[PDB]
């Protein structure tokens with residue numbers, strides 16, 4: 038048939054693409070609100086009306102294990118902290134000798150230590166004795182006795198500004214013009230292959246950036262059942278992402294009361310430290326209910342057995358070593374940094390057939406090094422008053438041991454230190470596409486000479 | 487024994503010597519798509535219609 | 539009916555050719571969500587550098603969206619049909635490019651799977667478009683003027 | 686006669702329709718006063734940061750002037766008349782939109798007070814322009830080709 | 833034959849008028865060598881400032897290439913011929929502008945030395961182009977509508 042090309046512009050076709058998205062946070066007046074590191078000078082106020090245009094007949098292939106949104110969220114998070122902490126004061130004078138001692142007179146199991154050191158007055162030629170109350174994790178020994186901080190060898194401990202506030206605030210990742218984001222709505226999506234229900238979205242829902250290990254706090258829930266999700270299930274070195282359909286609540290506190298000193302450093306730059314224990318010394322702890330935790334493990338075992346076998350025995354162990362960042366459960370709540378001992382949750386067997394809460398003891402330290410960069414460290418100023426937190430547990434990160442024996446007993450352990458498992462468990466249903474408007478098609482049109 | 491007026495709170499930044507602060511006429515201009523309108527009425531108290 | 543942006547992605551070539559103005563205005567004028575980059579009145583110092591490091595990353599996606607748009611609008615001016623969202627270019631459809639017959643294309647194929655088959659030949663289909671227009675503009679029109 | 690930019694702001698709709706090329710070229714090519722942003726040869730350090738903080742504020746008004754210009758030029762391509770500073774769109778003037786009769790509009794009204802009366806109905810006047818062009822481009826022209 | 837960019841700089845006005853699409857697409861879409869400005873994944877701090885000081889100097893040449901392009905494309909819309917790489921404007925060639933006769937121009941002169949002779953009169957040749965189009969658009973077309 039004798040036909041002639043016609044040219045169409047605006048035709049709805051796609052190619053897969055890679056690009057850099059928009060931070061796009063939510064916004065208010067914030068006239069008295071303290072500058073907040075997660076947003077401010079990075080984000081723009083959010084389209085208040087996302088439109089989820091449901092497509093017909095479209096079947097697209099997604100892959101959550103090769104996504105770039107997870108790979109640039111981990112790069113922005115380092116760049117959001119590293120750009121806020123340029124103006125902040127360095128704590129270089131505090132690398133001195135400390136005349137410290139115990140706080141109590143009768144040791145039961147101590148925690149705090151009471152120190153003494155010199156510090157400059159206003160005029161920088163006069164020296165005075167000042168004290169503070171440092172935790173014992175943040176103090177090491179030189180040789181009555183004389184102590185010093187944990188990192189005077191290599192690191193410059195940058196005091197986090199007091200006008201700052203670190204806090205989960207929902208970031209919406211948006212695409213600029215010429216790009217689009219596609220959302221899966223299939224409820225059985227294990228993470229790869231075709232998604233038979235696709236809808237274009239302007240901007241994703243608001244994920245709350247929380248940096249935790251071994252357990253996923255304030256996450257997004259499943260839809261019908263528990264969703265077990267991993268890459269190459271028979272491979273040991275791959276983590277196993279678990280996602281709940283119902284939240285499991287937690288209650289955390291620091292039950293001792295504290296105030297702040299105001300030991301100055303220089304003209305206009307002070308330093309905060311722990312001053313007094315107004316009350317009684319108590320250990321920080323967290324509660325998980327037991328009847329809800331024993332039923333939430335009744336579902337994770339149930340759908341592990343569809344991947345391994347019905348007649349197998351499924352057991353949970355606790356850990357096998359490492360630093361505090363990967364043997365325990367890390368938080369960021371209320372301005373302090375809790376590292377709770379979770380050897381009481383992950384301890385049971387399963388054999389294929391009211392109000393009593395599980396208490397979790399918990400440590401505190403205030404000189405943290407996040408991402409383990411060489412010669413860098415942070416410092417969290419103390420919070421005046423006791424701290425209270427309430428959170429949900431929506432998900433786990435297990436890992437499988439698997440040596441070469443013949444036994445029918447699998448053992449699953451919680452896993453820690455890689456932040457890309459926190460983000461890959463949230464942006465799994467997305468893909469960015471490119472919009473190519475020109476197209477050609479044969480017809481009977483003939484320009485008319 | 488004396489001292490300066492602000493050793494408590496302030497960091498007194500010495501203004502560089504290579505500097506010069508001096509009145510120099512700034513002209514405020516509008517970029518494309520925008521325009522500035524000037525009143526020429528000689529009785530303009532500051533509000534209402536300007537007939538020129 | 540307008541279903542919104544990309545709503546006709548699963549429809550036919552016949553039924554999705556009703557919606558061509560949607561993917562054109564949202565290819566540029568979806569930037570109205572980016573003109574918020576003139577931000578609120580900033581405070582004093584302490585992160586004055588963070589204000590401009592994140593200012594370029596907002597502006598590379600503004601400029602890159604503009605200067606990828608003009609080179610696809612200009613290319614329609616090379617072929618002889620600028621402005622029109624539908625033009626006809628008077629180049630014979632060689633039957634080695636594709637297949638069946640005219641009528642199983644517009645009734646039960648989508649543009650996405652159509653684009654797959656003809657993507658292999660797109661640089662030679664774009665080759666004849668700039669040749670059947672040059673023969674008309676410099677030869678025919680200056681001859682039909684004086685004759 | 687050309688009185689300069691916006692000089693016909695107080696004239697009639699009849700007498701100010703002579704000057705339409707003035708507010709078009711000074712809507713973009715008044716940027717010739719901004720191309721001085723390629724500044725003189727700068728000295729050494731000591732305010733190298735001030736050179737780029739004030740560099741973005743100069744460039745947001747360059748980019749924002751460009752990408753507000755294209756979306757109003759493209760919209761004329763949707764209606765069927767691109768390029769022309771005067772086009773005619775063949776949509777009947779509904780007599781509920783406005784008033785008197787054709788002749789007290791062009792002789793003793795200005796465009797500013799005319800824009801006030803018809804601003805309330807501008808999104809429905811722009812609604813019929815993209816419909817009397819779509820009926821012509823996809824229906825009429827492909828039927829008058831083959832017939 | 834296409835010799836590449838500016839290849840017909842030494843040819844005649846007759847033989848170099850075959851190659852007009854080359855200096856048009858390489859006037860804008862030679863920017864494809866600049867879209868590499870979305871660089872590789874940068875490392876940590878220590879020269880985070882050098883990344884944005886050299887970022888503006890890359891982007892002034894992107895924006896300046898765009899907004900010098902549009903004002904020369906718009907000017908063809910003032911004269912009445914937008915889109916076309918060859919248009920004809922119906923303005924009589926005054927014989928005080930230039931010289932010999934029609935035929936020693938297209939056969940043994942280049943565009944460079946032709947541009948020298950007519951550069952002295954270019955602002956008055958551009959003056960009549962916007963006047964023989966205004967007389968057609970506002971006078972003739974609205975009279976040939978109603979009559």
Ligand SMILES: *[C@@H]1O[C@H](CO)[C@@H](O[C@@H]2O[C@H](CO)[C@@H](O[C@@H]3O[C@H](CO)[C@@H](O)[C@H](O[C@H]4O[C@H](CO)[C@@H](O)[C@H](O)[C@@H]4O)[C@@H]3O)[C@H](O)[C@H]2NC(C)=O)[C@H](O)[C@H]1NC(C)=O
Nearest residue numbers: 071204205247254255368369370371372420426427428429
């Ligand atoms: C998981 O999500 C939960 C639910 O949102 C979240 O709990 C929230 O924690 C924040 C911690 O900042 C709470 O905010 C505080 O709430 C108390 C309630 O009395 C207020 O007093 C606080 O106000 C102070 O805020 C600053 C603290 O110094 C001061 O600058 C200020 O002047 C006030 O003194 C503050 O608003 C928030 O209320 C809860 N949400 C609910 C619903 O209770 C939890 O933190 C998340 N988990 C993790 C690990 O982040």
Ligand SMILES: *[C@@H]1O[C@H](CO)[C@@H](O[C@@H]2O[C@H](CO)[C@@H](O[C@@H]3O[C@H](CO)[C@@H](O)[C@H](O)[C@@H]3O)[C@H](O)[C@H]2NC(C)=O)[C@H](O)[C@H]1NC(C)=O
Nearest residue numbers: 225226227228229230231265266267268269270271343344
């Ligand atoms: C997540 O879900 C996807 C799809 O629901 C699973 O992909 C499926 O993987 C199995 C692996 O055995 C594929 O079966 C094999 O197919 C090949 C031919 O393709 C055949 O040679 C083999 O004998 C076997 O039948 C199956 O095709 C594939 N599904 C699709 C639609 O292609 C994936 O395994 C799931 N992930 C996990 C961890 O379970």
Ligand SMILES: *[C@@H]1O[C@H](CO)[C@@H](O[C@@H]2O[C@H](CO)[C@@H](O[C@@H]3O[C@H](CO)[C@@H](O)[C@H](O)[C@@H]3O)[C@H](O)[C@H]2NC(C)=O)[C@H](O)[C@H]1NC(C)=O
Nearest residue numbers: 523524525526527528529530531532533534535536537538
């Ligand atoms: C600056 O000049 C303006 C205009 O020249 C002054 O505005 C005038 O203010 C008076 C206030 O009494 C207005 O008079 C009142 O009008 C209302 C109706 O609008 C009427 O109800 C009152 O009884 C009274 O007559 C007057 O209308 C207004 N001028 C115009 C043109 O509207 C303004 O007061 C001057 N400022 C100062 C500080 O004097």
Ligand SMILES: *[C@@H]1O[C@H](CO)[C@@H](O[C@@H]2O[C@H](CO)[C@@H](O)[C@H](O)[C@H]2NC(C)=O)[C@H](O)[C@H]1NC(C)=O
Nearest residue numbers: 092093094095547548549550553645646647648
């Ligand atoms: C998916 O595409 C089909 C086109 O094949 C749409 O239209 C249906 O087409 C079949 C076969 O031509 C008919 O039997 C159906 O009656 C058509 N649907 C309707 C509603 O008339 C179909 O509509 C598209 N899918 C959806 C969910 O709209």
Ligand SMILES: *[C@@H]1O[C@H](CO)[C@@H](O[C@@H]2O[C@H](CO)[C@@H](O)[C@H](O)[C@H]2NC(C)=O)[C@H](O)[C@H]1NC(C)=O
Nearest residue numbers: 138139140141144145146147148150173181182
């Ligand atoms: C302060 O408390 C610490 C923590 O218990 C005491 O540390 C002891 O240090 C000695 C020194 O070698 C060790 O042998 C002990 O094992 C440590 N623990 C205990 C429980 O004795 C320390 O003794 C306390 N300070 C003083 C002055 O007694």
Ligand SMILES: *[C@@H]1O[C@H](CO)[C@@H](O[C@@H]2O[C@H](CO)[C@@H](O)[C@H](O)[C@H]2NC(C)=O)[C@H](O)[C@H]1NC(C)=O
Nearest residue numbers: 139140141151152153166168169170312313314
């Ligand atoms: C930590 O040690 C300091 C001194 O090293 C204690 O401060 C002293 O408290 C007594 C109260 O009986 C006062 O009489 C002294 O004047 C204080 N000394 C100074 C220098 O202020 C402080 O009480 C200790 N803190 C704890 C929790 O034991």
Ligand SMILES: *[C@@H]1O[C@H](CO)[C@@H](O[C@@H]2O[C@H](CO)[C@@H](O)[C@H](O)[C@H]2NC(C)=O)[C@H](O)[C@H]1NC(C)=O
Nearest residue numbers: 176177178179180184185186187188189190191
């Ligand atoms: C700084 O580093 C030195 C070297 O590691 C620490 O001193 C001890 O040095 C001996 C021999 O080099 C090691 O065997 C010990 O393990 C070191 N002790 C510790 C606690 O690491 C010194 O303590 C370090 N100082 C700080 C503040 O960390």
Ligand SMILES: *[C@@H]1O[C@H](CO)[C@@H](O[C@@H]2O[C@H](CO)[C@@H](O)[C@H](O)[C@H]2NC(C)=O)[C@H](O)[C@H]1NC(C)=O
Nearest residue numbers: 292293294295296297313315316421422423424
């Ligand atoms: C923690 O300690 C502070 C004091 O440092 C307590 O605040 C006092 O509360 C009482 C009772 O309301 C008031 O009379 C005092 O005026 C408060 N003092 C200050 C300085 O504000 C606070 O209540 C304690 N928190 C808890 C949970 O016991």
Ligand SMILES: *[C@@H]1O[C@H](CO)[C@@H](O[C@@H]2O[C@H](CO)[C@@H](O)[C@H](O)[C@H]2NC(C)=O)[C@H](O)[C@H]1NC(C)=O
Nearest residue numbers: 285286287288289324325326327329392394427
């Ligand atoms: C965590 O703390 C909350 C309180 O903030 C507890 O909620 C209360 O639970 C008791 C017992 O069921 C009820 O009588 C109260 O009415 C609840 N408070 C509210 C505000 O509803 C919750 O039980 C705690 N969770 C765990 C696991 O201990």
Ligand SMILES: *[C@@H]1O[C@H](CO)[C@@H](O[C@@H]2O[C@H](CO)[C@@H](O)[C@H](O)[C@H]2NC(C)=O)[C@H](O)[C@H]1NC(C)=O
Nearest residue numbers: 354355356357358364378379380381383384385
């Ligand atoms: C849970 O983990 C802890 C440490 O993380 C293990 O504790 C050790 O238990 C053995 C007894 O088999 C003791 O000899 C060690 O001293 C303990 N370690 C420490 C650091 O105290 C424990 O075995 C794990 N399992 C259970 C069921 O508690």
Ligand SMILES: *[C@@H]1O[C@H](CO)[C@@H](O[C@@H]2O[C@H](CO)[C@@H](O)[C@H](O)[C@H]2NC(C)=O)[C@H](O)[C@H]1NC(C)=O
Nearest residue numbers: 355361364365377378379380381382396397398
């Ligand atoms: C985490 O908690 C468990 C218990 O919940 C700790 O195990 C105890 O370890 C000490 C050290 O010898 C023993 O005296 C206790 O008998 C152990 N408890 C039980 C129930 O066996 C474990 O050590 C804690 N983790 C760390 C790192 O200390």
Ligand SMILES: *[C@@H]1O[C@H](CO)[C@@H](O[C@@H]2O[C@H](CO)[C@@H](O)[C@H](O)[C@H]2NC(C)=O)[C@H](O)[C@H]1NC(C)=O
Nearest residue numbers: 245254255256283284285286287427428429430
């Ligand atoms: C943490 O979990 C609780 C329990 O789901 C959430 O609180 C609400 O609980 C009621 C139960 O009566 C549900 O119907 C609501 O859907 C829950 N959400 C809201 C927003 O009301 C609580 O919101 C969870 N925390 C977060 C941060 O989402």
Ligand SMILES: *[C@@H]1O[C@H](CO)[C@@H](O[C@@H]2O[C@H](CO)[C@@H](O)[C@H](O)[C@H]2NC(C)=O)[C@H](O)[C@H]1NC(C)=O
Nearest residue numbers: 158159160304488489490491492493494495496
């Ligand atoms: C720094 O501040 C102190 C506190 O105001 C000044 O010392 C005097 O302190 C007493 C009691 O606190 C006040 O009643 C006096 O009014 C203060 N004197 C003055 C002059 O303010 C101290 O002088 C201040 N130093 C400087 C350099 O301003």
Ligand SMILES: *[C@@H]1O[C@H](CO)[C@@H](O)[C@H](O)[C@H]1NC(C)=O
Nearest residue numbers: 331332334335384385386387
């Ligand atoms: C949880 O419940 C199951 C079933 O009732 C029971 O076998 C088991 O002992 C309980 N406790 C734990 C720690 O698994």
Ligand SMILES: *[C@@H]1O[C@H](CO)[C@@H](O)[C@H](O)[C@H]1NC(C)=O
Nearest residue numbers: 342343344345346347348349
């Ligand atoms: C395991 O149990 C499931 C439950 O329905 C069943 O479908 C499957 O056949 C069982 N497999 C074996 C090997 O018994």
Ligand SMILES: *[C@@H]1O[C@H](CO)[C@@H](O)[C@H](O)[C@H]1NC(C)=O
Nearest residue numbers: 379380381382383384385386
């Ligand atoms: C671990 O499990 C054993 C056996 O059920 C139990 O006795 C022990 O208390 C558990 N450990 C902790 C820390 O609760």
